[PDB]
C-alpha cells in the first residue's frame, strides 16, 4: 500500500497515468497521479467521497479500482486500478479510419451489450473513456451532449451510448459541426445519416432508437437487452 511497492513501466496519458508493475507478485496495473498540493481541506472531503464511491463498484464491465497510495514527500495521491491491455475505443476508431476497414458488427454488439450492463449497474462517456481487455472485453471508466442536457435523466446515458455506437459503426459522431451552436442546431434538428450499409437494419434500428430526441422514446436499459440482436457471446467472458 505504498508507492515503493510498485515499479513504473512508462506513462500512458498525462492527473497523469503511469502503468505499474507490483514487485510482490508481478501484477500489471495502472495508477493515476493526482497532486493535491494546491488543494485545501475543501478538496479533501470531495475527493475522498469520490474515492469511496469509485473503490466500491465491482462490475466486470467497469474498470476495477483497487488501492490508494500517498507519498506526502511528493503530495501526489496514486489511485490504483486495472490495466485494460487492449487500449481505449478512440484508438480502435483511429485504427479503423487509418486502415479503411469498418469494425465488425459483432464487436459493435459486444460494446453495446457490455456498456448497457455497465450503465444499468451505474443507475442501480466517450470512445476515450472505454477500454478493452485481452479478451476484447469492454470496460467503462473515467458532440455527445443530449437534447435535454441542452434543452439529466437515465435516458441521457442512452443517448450518449447511441452516439458512441454510431461513432463505432460510421467512424465519426452522428452530428458533425464546426461551431457549438451549429452542433446544437443539428442535434435539435435530430437528423443523421444511416450507419454504413454493412450493418443490419436491426443494429441501425436500436442505435437510432437510442438517438431519439424525446427521452421517453429511447430504449430503457432492459429494452436494449430484450432485443433479439443481443446474444450470449456479446457478454463479458472472463
Ligand atoms: C491510464 C490510462 C489507462 N490505460 C490502459 N491501457 C491502455 C490504454 C490506452 C492505450 C492507448 C493510449 N491511450 O495511448 C494503451 C493501453 N488501461 C487503463 N485502465 C485505467 N486506466 C488506463
From Swiss-Prot:
It is an enzyme of class 2 (transferase). The modification Phosphoserine is found at residues 146, 200. Residues 6-230 form the Protein kinase domain. ATP binds at residues 12-17, 32. Its cofactor is Mg(2+). Induction: Expression and activity peak in the G2 phase of the mitotic cycle and decrease once the cells have entered mitosis due to degradation by the anaphase promoting complex APC/C-CDC20. In G1 phase, both isoform 1 and isoform 2 are almost undetectable. However, at the G1/S transition, there is an increase in expression of both isoforms which then remain at this increased level throughout S and G2. At the onset of mitosis, isoform 1 undergoes a rapid disappearance whereas isoform 2 continues to be present at about the same level as in G2. Isoform 1 and isoform 2 are expressed in peripheral blood T-cells and a wide variety of transformed cell types. Isoform 1 and isoform 4 are expressed in the testis. Up-regulated in various cancer cell lines, as well as primary breast tumors. Disulfide bonds: none annotated. Its EC number is 2.7.11.1. The keyword Cell membrane does not apply. Isoform 1, isoform 2 and isoform 4 form homo- and heterodimers. Interacts with NECAB3 and HMGA2. Isoform 1 interacts with CDC20, CTNB1, MAD1L1, MAPK, NEK11, NPM1, NDC80, PCNT and SGO1. Isoform 1 interacts with STK3/MST2 (via SARAH domain) and SAV1 (via SARAH domain). Isoform 1 and isoform 2 interact with MAD2L1. Isoform 1 and isoform 4 interact with PPP1CA and PPP1CC. Interacts with CEP68; the interaction leads to phosphorylation of CEP68. Interacts with CNTLN; the interaction leads to phosphorylation of CNTLN. Isoform 1 interacts with CEP85. Protein kinase which is involved in the control of centrosome separation and bipolar spindle formation in mitotic cells and chromatin condensation in meiotic cells. Regulates centrosome separation (essential for the formation of bipolar spindles and high-fidelity chromosome separation) by phosphorylating centrosomal proteins such as CROCC, CEP250 and NINL, resulting in their displacement from the centrosomes. Regulates kinetochore microtubule attachment stability in mitosis via phosphorylation of NDC80. This is Serine/threonine-protein kinase Nek2. It comes from Homo sapiens (Human). The lineage of its organism: Eukaryota, Metazoa, Chordata, Craniata, Vertebrata. The chain holds residues 3 to 271 of 445 of the full protein.
Amino acid at each position: 500500500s505504498r508507492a515503493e511497492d510498485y515499479e513504473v513501466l512508462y506513462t500512458i496519458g498525462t492527473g497523469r497515468c503511469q502503468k505499474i508493475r507490483r514487485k510482490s507478485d508481478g501484477k500489471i496495473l495502472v495508477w493515476k497521479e493526482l497532486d493535491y498540493g494546491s488543494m485545501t481541506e475543501a478538496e479533501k472531503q470531495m475527493l475522498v467521497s469520490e474515492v469511496n464511491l469509485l473503490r466500491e463498484l465491482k462490475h466486470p464491465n467497469i474498470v476495477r479500482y483497487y488501492d490508494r497510495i500517498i507519498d506526502r514527500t511528493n503530495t501526489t495521491l496514486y489511485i490504483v486500478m486495472e490495466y485494460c491491455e487492449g487500449g481505449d475505443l478512440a484508438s480502435v476508431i483511429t485504427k479503423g479510419t487509418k486502415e479503411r476497414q469498418y469494425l465488425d458488427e459483432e464487436f459493435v454488439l459486444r460494446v453495446m451489450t457490455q456498456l448497457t450492463l455497465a450503465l444499468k449497474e451505474c443507475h442501480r462517456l466517450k470512445p476515450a473513456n472505454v477500454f478493452l481487455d485481452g479478451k476484447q472485453n469492454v470496460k467503462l471508466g473515467d458532440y455527445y451532449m443530449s437534447p435535454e442536457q441542452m434543452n439529466y435523466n437515465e435516458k441521457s446515458d442512452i443517448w450518449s451510448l447511441g452516439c458512441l455506437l454510431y461513432e463505432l459503426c460510421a467512424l465519426m459522431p452522428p452530428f458533425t459541426a464546426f461551431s457549438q451552436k451549429e452542433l446544437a442546431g443539428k442535434i435539435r434538428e435530430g437528423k443523421f445519416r444511416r450507419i454504413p450499409y454493412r450493418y443490419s437494419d436491426e443494429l441501425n434500428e436500436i442505435i437510432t432508437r437510442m438517438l431519439n430526441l424525446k427521452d421517453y422514446h429511447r430504449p430503457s436499459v432492459e429494452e436494449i437487452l430484450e432485443n433479439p440482436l443481443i446474444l450470449e457471446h456479446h457478454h463479458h467472458h472472463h
